[PDB]
DNA sequence: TTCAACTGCTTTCGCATCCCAACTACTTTTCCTCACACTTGTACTCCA
């Protein structure tokens, strides 16, 4: 057997609140900047497809 | 009634000229160590 080099250390992150951006007041990007998770364009369409207007809100 | 340029769009996180220096020179900083020309008697006879 063989052990591969790439491992799962720098993969997880959690944010309750924290830093923002100065222009948008949205959560900052960043793995080590303690930054937010992106709800992208396709996830906006997935939250309309459930008809969940408050989860989108 | 058509040809030819101006036209925004392919994804989904995360990865990823001026300055410096070299070596060898020449020089300055000064402080220390003595000589070189001048002069009156004295000495050896000098001429009286």
Curated annotation (Swiss-Prot):
Species of the source: Saccharomyces cerevisiae (strain ATCC 204508 / S288c)
Subunit structure: Component of the RNA polymerase I (Pol I) complex consisting of 14 subunits: RPA135, RPA190, RPC40, RPA14, RPB5, RPO26, RPA43, RPB8, RPA12, RPB10, RPC19, RPC10, RPA49 and RPA34. The complex is composed of a horseshoe-shaped core containing ten subunits (RPA135, RPA190, RPB5, RPO26, RPB8, RPB10, RPC10, RPA12, RPC19 and RPC40) where RPA135 and RPA190 form the DNA-binding cleft. Outside of the core, RPA14 and RPA43 form the stalk that mediates interactions with transcription initiation factors and newly synthesized RNA.
Superkingdom of origin organism: Eukaryota
Name assigned to this protein: DNA-directed RNA polymerase I subunit RPA135
Other facts: Three distinct zinc-containing RNA polymerases are found in eukaryotic nuclei: polymerase I for the ribosomal RNA precursor, polymerase II for the mRNA precursor, and polymerase III for 5S and tRNA genes.
Subcellular location: Nucleus, Nucleolus
Segment of the intact protein contained: 1033 to 1089 of 1203
Biological function: DNA-dependent RNA polymerases catalyze the transcription of DNA into RNA using the four ribonucleoside triphosphates as substrates. Component of RNA polymerase I (Pol I) which synthesizes ribosomal RNA precursors. Besides, RNA polymerase I has intrinsic RNA cleavage activity. RPA190 and RPA135 both contribute to the polymerase catalytic activity and together form the Pol I active center. In addition, subunit RPA12 contributes a catalytic zinc ribbon that is required for RNA cleavage by Pol I.
Family: Belongs to the RNA polymerase beta chain family.
């Amino acid at each position: 057997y063989q052990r591969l080099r790439h491992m799962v250390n720098d993969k997880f992150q959690v944010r309750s609140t924290g830093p923002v951006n100065s222009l948008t007041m949205q959560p900052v990007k960043g793995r080590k900047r303690h930054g937010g998770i992106r709800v992208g364009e396709m996830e906006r369409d997935a939250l309309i497809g459930h008809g969940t207007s408050f989860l989108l809100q």
